[PDB]
Each structure stands twice: as structure tokens, then as C-alpha cells.
Amino acid sequence: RFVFPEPTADVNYIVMLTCAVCLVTYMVMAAILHKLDQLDASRGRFKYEILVKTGWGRGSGTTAHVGIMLYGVDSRSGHRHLDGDRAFHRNSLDIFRIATPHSLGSVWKIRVWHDNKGLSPAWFLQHVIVRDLQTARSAFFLVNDWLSVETEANGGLVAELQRGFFDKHIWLSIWDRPPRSRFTRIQRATCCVLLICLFLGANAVWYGAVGDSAYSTGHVSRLSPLSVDTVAVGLVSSVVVYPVYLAILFLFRASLAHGLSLLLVAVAVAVSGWVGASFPPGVSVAWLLSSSASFLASFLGWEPLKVLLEALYFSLLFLAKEEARKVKRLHGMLRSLLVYMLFLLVTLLASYGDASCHGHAYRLQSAIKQELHSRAFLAITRSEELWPWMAHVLLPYVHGNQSSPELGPPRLRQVRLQEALYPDPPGPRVHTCSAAGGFSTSDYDVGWESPHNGSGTWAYSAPDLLGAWSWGSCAVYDSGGYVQELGLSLEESRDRLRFLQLHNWLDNRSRAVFLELTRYSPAVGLHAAVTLRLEFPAAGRALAALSVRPFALRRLSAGLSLPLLTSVCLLLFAVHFAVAEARTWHREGRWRVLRLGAWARWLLVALTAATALVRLAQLGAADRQWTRFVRGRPRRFTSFDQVAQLSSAARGLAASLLFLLLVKAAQQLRFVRQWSVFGKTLCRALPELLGVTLGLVVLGVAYARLWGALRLGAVILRWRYHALRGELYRP
């Protein structure tokens, strides 16, 4: 049923970013796992530190190695080989003290066994005498008996499952490797990345290529997990990988599989990209949800199923402290890298999902500015030159002849301020905006102010709660003012104009004209809010400004679009960060100042919350404005001028968050041994550089680039670099 479809030329950034992140996380995890396993060959509490001299064993005087498996809850122990300086001299009571990392509950948790290296004892040793040193987790008591000879004595005062429970779980078996297992990490991280890549490829080939099963599934069903395409496909595609997955896994237990897995990963990524480069925007969200559901189902359900099936089938001092703590740090780094990668992927999807829309928006805004003769409009000084411009280039543009999709007639709302402007007296041509007064909030009649019986055709048109603020060069305006509609067609608009300059509508009291309209481009599917402002500092001076903001009108009622998913994920991440930082605050106490610390975590939390909140507000505002526009439509001019500003704010916040994440990665690169002298040097001299530059800028301020040719920081940086190199390279 394969089609070889989509001869189209397009790029889908979601799949590419997901695959790139999933490969980069493996690339950075491999180094940490290799470093962790370099020391695993070096190595290869639960009781007290007392001697284990035999007190119930006699007759069999020889040497024999024994091992006690201290089984526990989420703490595996294993067996320790017994040795001695005298090679366990015969006719003596062997005494030692061996404890495993396991620190299970202080209950009857032990399982001992004695190897029969030749002679075997008819009786049994009492125990390894131990009462309490630090935890006293394993009980030590005599048994006065044992199991059959040349076997394992029953350790009392399920095993098959626990022996292979969390180390045969592959997924969470990275930091649970048995000390003497020969399935070292490299073969536990290659299987996970292979499984993830195969999940991605198998879920991408379904939506892209094999989607015409008798035209089986529609491709229109909702993105929500409604027991539908989004979730069922994940379960169906989680089983196709398992044949080859188990084949590679059982091939791992020669080195051929380590190349076959990478080849499969590469081909899966290539197929995923090629078949997803034609995904519509409503499927890339479905693909991500399907992949996540497949991963969750596979892991949670069918890794325990695999281990249970295998178990059922089977059934029928300084060096130690300094090299045993580094394992904890490595595990912490391992479990923090995944969180950082998830955050980075979420941010990348939030900010870089529609770069093609970015380019199209730039081109569209450039074209709109070019088509309206922005140069001519900007170079205006006479208060009367506006009318020829509007009659020549505006009216033929808004109406046209089968051109310029308008989406709402334009408006000409203006502010009055009800005061005669004083002309600027001659002089040095001051660049201020003096002669300012209170505004006007009254209703007039045809011509000008003449209330006869009721409000005239010139009403105030009071502003709404959400109408955006212009923030001009003289003051801050709102969405209120005397509105005038420019007709509907190019037959009455000319008469409307002739009326407007016939009855001195723009007298010598007004401040602005605020010509505003919207535009739509269906080829790229982008809206554009266009505004034009003519400030009036004095009588007949004017200042011309224009703003064309392109955006994409996506509404909260559209369903489960990508921005909503990214916003909720960012909210969850911010909540988790806030909870973790609050717990750190509570445990530590107070006085957490004069450090990056909380003063950086709070900033990160605030940025993460603000991005999602702004995106949600933009979605809600767009939905409300579109719903208002639909109801009615002719000659009402619903304004989309505040949606564009919210979209720009959300984009800026997402860009700032991504920049912060990239800088954090750059400063976290310092973990290489020979490359650790760069971050250390900067982190020590940076406060000094800030202090000296702050002391220098105030020296130039008290008087009334700085070091672009002086290079004073070079001396401090060189001194710090030499000091750290001496302190690190030699000792």
C-alpha cells in the first residue's frame, strides 16, 4: 500500500527539530555514560564493622569464598568475594567485613550462600557478626542448619523477578547496572535511542505514506486523546518495532549490532524527515501526541510485561569515598540532562515552528509598505497634503479592481483635544511637542459643535477595554476618538471625503488622524494590521508614522494547536521549577542572597510563566476579536491591532528564553577536563570587570568606545588564566 507520495518541495521543522534533539541528547549522554563505566571495571552500611570470625563452624578447615545477597526494596546488593592476607589459612575462623551499597530497611533481609570449592561443611557458619555501625540494615543471627551440601543455604531470618526487575527494564536500567554484568552502558543507551527513533519513524510513516487504507482513517479527527487515531496508532505502532528491537537486544548479549543499530537510526530519521516534509499543520501535533503515547505505553506497560515473561520462563577508605560519590554526581547529571533536553525541545517547538511564516510575514510587510508609497506619506508637513495622498494612493488601494483582499473597511478615528493649537513662534526650530492641553470627550453635530436636540453624527465613540495604545512621539493614545468610515465602494468614499474637507473636519484643534485598516493574504495565510498616524505638535507641522504588523490569526477555539500545547508544557515546567526552588528555600532556610541561585531561578520561572501567559492571552484576544468580527461584518471595522502586539511580545519572550537556554548550555560545556580553564577564568574575573566598567562609566558621567581600543580586561583575564593554569596543570 506504499505510495511514494509528496513530490512537493517543503520543509517541516517540527520533525527535524525533534529528531535533532533526540540525537543530540544521545550524543551528550554517551560521553557521561562512557565516563561512568570507565570506573565500573575498577570496582569489580547494611551491617556493622565487626569481625565475622566463625563460631559455629568446625571440622572443615580450608578456604572457601561465600556471598551474601542483601535483597531489599529498590536497593540491590549482590555478593562479595571473600579473601585474606593469608589466603584464608585453613584450620582457622575466617573474619572479615563486606557490605554492599544496598541500605534497605532494618528488617530480616539477607540471602547468604557458600561455594563448595572442594571440601564442604556438614554444619553451617553462624553469621557474619555485626550489630550496628551506621544503619544496621542486615540482621546477623545463627542458623544452626543449612540447605543441601554444595548448594546455597536458605537465607531467611520473587527472587527471580527482583534480580532482573530494574536492570532488565532497559529504559530505567541506565543507572542500575549490575557490578559484574557485561551489558555495560553503551549497549543500554544505543537500544533506547534506537527504540525512540524507530517509534518516530513508524509513527511518521503512518500519517505520511500509509494513510490511504481504503482511505481508512480520515485525517480529520480531533487531536485530543479520544480513543481515536492519535492514541490507537501509537499502540498499534509500538509492536512493529519490537521484532527488530528484540533481535538487536539479544544480539547485544558481537559488535555487529552496534553498527546495525546506527544504520537503522539513520534510515529511520531520513524516512521520518522525507515523509513528514509534507505534513499539514493539523497532523504534526497529532504525530507528536502519537509518539508520546507510544513511548509511554511501550515503557510503562510492556517493559514490565517483558521482564515478567522472562522471569516466568526462567522459573520453569579514601579511595572508596572519593570514587563512590562521583557515581552520585554522574547520576544527578544524567537525570538533569534529560530535563534540560525536554525543556529545550519544548522551547524550540514553541518558538521555531513556523519560520516559513516568519519569512512570508517579512516579505508581506515589505510589499505592503512598498505598495502604499511609505516614502511619500512619511515626508509630509502640511496638514492638507493628507487628502491628495488619500485620494491618489489610498482609495484606489482599498477598493481597487479585483485586488487587495481588505477584510473590513478602513476607519479614520481622530482625537480633538478641543483647544486651538498655538503656531510655533519663529526661532531655533525647537524639537519639542509643547502647547499641550486636555482632551475632548463630547458629542457634536454636522459641521462642528451645535447640540440641537440630541447627539449628532459626530459622536465620541468611547474606547474599549482592550484597544492597544499607540505610544506616539508626543503622548500615549487609546482606542477612542471621533470615527469616520470611508464608505464601502469607490463611489461614495469620494463624497465622504468632499464632506470631510468641506466642513473643516480637520480644524486647527486636532492632534492625530489615525488612519487604520487590515489586510489578508490567503496564499501565505497571514493577516496584517496597518496603522498610520499624523501627530500635530503645533498648527500645521505634523509628524508621519506608519506601522505594518503581520501576524497569524490563530484562535483558542481552533482546538489543540501547537501553541496551546507548548504553553501548557511551559506552564508545567514553570510549576515544577517553582516547587523545586520553594523546597530548596524551605530546607535551607533563609539568607539566600549575594549569589546567582534563587535570584536566577526566580527569573527563569518568571520568564517561563510570562511566555505561556502572553501566548494564551494572544490566543484569547484573537478568538474574541474574530468572534466579534464575524457577527455582523459590513461597516463596523473590528480592530485586530492588539493581537499583533501580543504575538510580537510572545515571540520576543520565547526568543529570550531560548537565548538563555543556549547560554546556559555554553557555560555548561566547561565539563571537559582541558576546557575547564575557560569558565573558571571568566567566573572569577567577571565581577572585577563589571566593577571596573561601572567605576569607569560614572567617571564619564560626572564630567557630563570605552575599551574598544584600550583593552584593559585583557590584563585581568591573562592574570587569571595564568593563575588557574598554574593551579591546575601542575598539581
Binding site: E371, V524, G652, F659, W707, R718
Partner: protein
């Protein structure tokens, strides 16, 4: 109509004085969002080479160049076949294979575009028809690029022989010793540079016309280091986050990273000089 997306105009000229054809192409693009984007190209290609003695001299030089390339590849393969089966930890052998590969590609392109000149023969039969000379210009451009990069890399290869006197040995020693640390810090420099570039692309990329593309953002940020920026479109693009980006970028980049590069080079240069002085004074 409104559905047209592109328009091409093509012709060519000869200029019999100096034997040199010239193909002229003019393109006008009509994007879906409106407007017009013009572009042009004028390629002065040559097709009647062997007319004068200097062209015979150039052909002989090309033959000698082919023989030189053959000798170089033979000696390289002879060296690799028996001696030093690893061979790649010198930085003077990757350059050799790069030069050989680029020269082989250039020779292949030249042969391909010199044998396929039947369009001129077809045109000379009926001269009242359009001469199709676009593939020749495209391949000429490609060959020019390959020749340029090869010529650039040969002068870099020249460095192997300037080690005659002692005062030139310490400079090469310092460069070789500091290359690793320079690369290590350049990684971080590029990471921060790309972070700034992506931030600028996402913020100012729809209004400034200087950040309209990621490549354009990178070029603009390299030009800012030159002091070749106007400081205008950034601030009229956004009065907030406009000057903040410029100030933070200039401060951080210039001061911290330029001084760090200086410190890295200076420390190792002083260390090498002191080591050599001590060794000479103790022997």
C-alpha cells in the same frame, strides 16, 4: 496576469575584438505577497580558445598541471600504501588530499564543459535562432569557484617550508601549541554568537531588512565588530530591547571574548619563549 510568478529574459553577445562571449540573463520575480524582485547576471565566457599562440601556451601549461597532479596523487598513494597506515595526525596530509581532490574535480569539470560545446556548432548553422548558452556559464562559474579555492589552499600549503631560522621556529611552535585551546574557546564563541544571531533573527527579523535571514543576521553581527553599523534601524525598530541588544552584544563580545583570545595566545607564547630560553641557557 496576477498568477505569474517569474519572468526571464536571455540573450548573448560576441565582441569579435577580444574573443570573449557574454551571456546576459535578467530575472524578475513576483512573490505571492506582491511586489517585484529583480536579479541579473552577465557571464563573460570564452569558447574559441585556440586562436593565438598564448592560448597554445595556456594549453601546454594545463597539460603540465595535469601531469603535476598525476605525480602528486601517485606519490601520495605510494606513501599511504606501505608507510604510516594511519597517516592523519599531521594536518599536512589532510591538506594534501584536499588539494588533490579539488584539483581532480576541477579537471573533471573542465573536461566536461570543454567536450560539451555542441551548442555553438548548432547555433552556427542557423543564426536566426536563440543560442542556448546557460549551462556553459553555470559550469564556468563552478570551475571558477573550484580554481579559486584550490589556489587559496596552495598558498596555505606553502607554510610547510618557512622554518629555516630559529626565530621562525618559535612562532610555528606557539601556533601549533595554542591551536587546540583556540579551537576549544572558539566553540564557546560560536555558540554565544549563534545564540545572539537567533535572538536577533526572531526579534528584528520582520522589520529591519538587515536581519531578514539567519545568514543575514550572522553577516550583520560580523559587520558590527567592524564598526560598520548605523545604529538606526535597530532603535527605530524597537526603542526597548533594541539598544539593549546592541549594548550587551558589543560589551560582552568585544571585551570578554576578544580579551580572552588575547590572553590565551599571550600566555602560551610567553610560556614557549621562556621554555626555549631556559633550554638554551641550560645547554
Amino acid at each position: 496576469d496576477r498568477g505569474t510568478r517569474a519572468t526571464f529574459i536571455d540573450f548573448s553577445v560576441y565582441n569579435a575584438n577580444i574573443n570573449l562571449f557574454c551571456v546576459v540573463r535578467l530575472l524578475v520575480e513576483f512573490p505571492a505577497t506582491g511586489g517585484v524582485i529583480p536579479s541579473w547576471q552577465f557571464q563573460p565566457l570564452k569558447l574559441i580558445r585556440y586562436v593565438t599562440t598564448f592560448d597554445f601556451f595556456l594549453a601546454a601549461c594545463e597539460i603540465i598541471f595535469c601531469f603535476f597532479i598525476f605525480y602528486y596523487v601517485v606519490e601520495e598513494i605510494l606513501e599511504i600504501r606501505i608507510h604510516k597506515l594511519h597517516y592523519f595526525r599531521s594536518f599536512w596530509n589532510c591538506l594534501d588530499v584536499v588539494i588533490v581532490v579539488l584539483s581532480v574535480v576541477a579537471i573533471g569539470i573542465n573536461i566536461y564543459r570543454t567536450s560539451n560545446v555542441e551548442v555553438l556548432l548548432q547555433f552556427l548553422e542557423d543564426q536566426n535562432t536563440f543560442p542556448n548558452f546557460e549551462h556553459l556559464a553555470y559550469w564556468q562559474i563552478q570551475f571558477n569557484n573550484i580554481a579559486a579555492v584550490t589556489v587559496f589552499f596552495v598558498w596555505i600549503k606553502l607554510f610547510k617550508f618557512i622554518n629555516f631560522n630559529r626565530t621562525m621556529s618559535q612562532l610555528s611552535t606557539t601556533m601549533s601549541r595554542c591551536a587546540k585551546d583556540l579551537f576549544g574557546f572558539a566553540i564557546m564563541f560560536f555558540i554565544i554568537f549563534l545564540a545572539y544571531a537567533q535572538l536577533a533573527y526572531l526579534v528584528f527579523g520582520t522589520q529591519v531588512d538587515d536581519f531578514s535571514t539567519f545568514q543575514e543576521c550572522i553577516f550583520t553581527q560580523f559587520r558590527i565588530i567592524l564598526g560598520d553599523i548605523n545604529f538606526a534601524e535597530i532603535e527605530e525598530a524597537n526603542r526597548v530591547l533594541g539598544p539593549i541588544y546592541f549594548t550587551t552584544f558589543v560589551f560582552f563580545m568585544f571585551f570578554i571574548l576578544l580579551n580572552m583570545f588575547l590572553a590565551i595566545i599571550n600566555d602560551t607564547y610567553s610560556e614557549v619563549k621562556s621554555d626555549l630560553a631556559q633550554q638554551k641557557a641550560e645547554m
